[PDB]
């Protein structure tokens, strides 16, 4: 009997940034969906490529856990065949994406009143990222006659910026923690089963 390492992922005190979304392995473990459903109550659930009820007996070879936080109004960005700032300049995925995504809210849990700038996101980048690509560089995106300096303001775009999330803001502006379970049913040994 092996305990799946899902509690820490689903109960992590802190979450990684959008440009540094946490990636975790899931293999060589046994998990039960009934206990998770009984003990976990998510808000938004969306699965492509497999029915929610078919996971009972499916012998998934491996799973990738991608955890991050985004803005509520940007929740539409994460979807197949979608174009946007988050999709292109921060995190790009294949158009024919398959897997599950669970999104929840921590407005009350993370109701840090006063300068809640713990979340940072890349404003823009020179080029468009490819599927399953990431970068943590601080290159200055000048694209103009402005001097090549890291100044935040008009006529000078900083590579990164802090989201203005507050508890009193609108619902669409509230933070959303998203965990994506990506399935790769390739020609590899099966290690996860019920």
């Amino acid at each position, epitope marked *: 009997t092996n305990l799946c390492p899902f509690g820490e992922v689903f109960n992590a005190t802190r979450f990684a940034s959008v440009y*540094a979304w*946490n990636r975790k392995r899931i293999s060589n473990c046994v998990a039960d969906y009934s206990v998770l459903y009984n003990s976990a109550s998510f808000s938004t659930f969306k699965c492509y490529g497999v029915s929610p009820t078919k996971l009972n007996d499916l012998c998934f070879t491996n799973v990738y856990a991608d955890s991050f936080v985004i803005r509520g109004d940007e929740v539409r960005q994460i979807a197949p065949g979608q174009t946007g700032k988050i999709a292109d300049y921060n995190y790009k995925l294949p158009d024919d994406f398959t897997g599950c995504v669970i999104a929840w809210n921590s407005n009350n849990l993370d109701s840090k009143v006063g300068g809640n700038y*713990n979340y940072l996101y890349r404003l823009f980048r020179k080029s468009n990222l490819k599927p399953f690509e*990431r970068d943590i560089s601080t290159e200055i995106y000048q694209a103009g006659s402005t001097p090549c300096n890291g100044v935040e303001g008009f006529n000078c775009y900083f590579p*990164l910026q802090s989201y203005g999330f507050q508890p009193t803001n609108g619902v669409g502006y509230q933070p959303y923690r998203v965990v994506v379970l990506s399935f790769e049913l390739l020609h590899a040994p099966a290690t996860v089963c019920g």
Partner: nanobody, 119 residues
Framework: HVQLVESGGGLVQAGGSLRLSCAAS????????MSWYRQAPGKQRELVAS?????NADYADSVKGRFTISRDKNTVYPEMSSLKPADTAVYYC???????????????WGQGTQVTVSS
């Protein structure tokens, strides 16, 4: 402002192993990915390592394994071993700084730590 300076440096022995510890003291911190770079005469900046917010770290083939970094609770634990004379260089730390547009619109580039092999 965030002061990421850890140490000035130190001597390196043949096949030595140094375990630095980041101070992680200063202003408000954040779960921002960091990068570890090398410098030396005759060579430009090299992408030695890039570590995310505790997820995983990518290292160059030459530096793979025999240098490593771990991120945990906004703390950096470096693990270094198998140091050779070819490692005599200057280490540079690259981080993310946002609240710096008031009096120092510059990236938080820590002071280069010089390392040399000498008994």
């Amino acid at each position: 402002h965030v002061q990421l300076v850890e140490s000035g440096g130190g001597l390196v022995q043949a096949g030595g192993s140094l375990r630095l510890s980041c101070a992680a003291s200063g202003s408000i911190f954040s779960s921002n990915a960091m990068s570890w770079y090398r410098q030396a005469p005759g060579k430009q900046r090299e992408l030695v390592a890039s570590i995310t917010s505790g997820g995983n770290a990518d290292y160059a083939d030459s530096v793979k394994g025999r240098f490593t970094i771990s991120r945990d609770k906004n703390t950096v634990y470096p693990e270094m071993s198998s140091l050779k004379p070819a490692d005599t260089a200057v280490y540079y730390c690259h981080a993310v700084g946002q609240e710096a547009s008031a009096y120092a619109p510059r990236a938080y580039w820590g002071q280069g730590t010089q390392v040399t092999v000498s008994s």
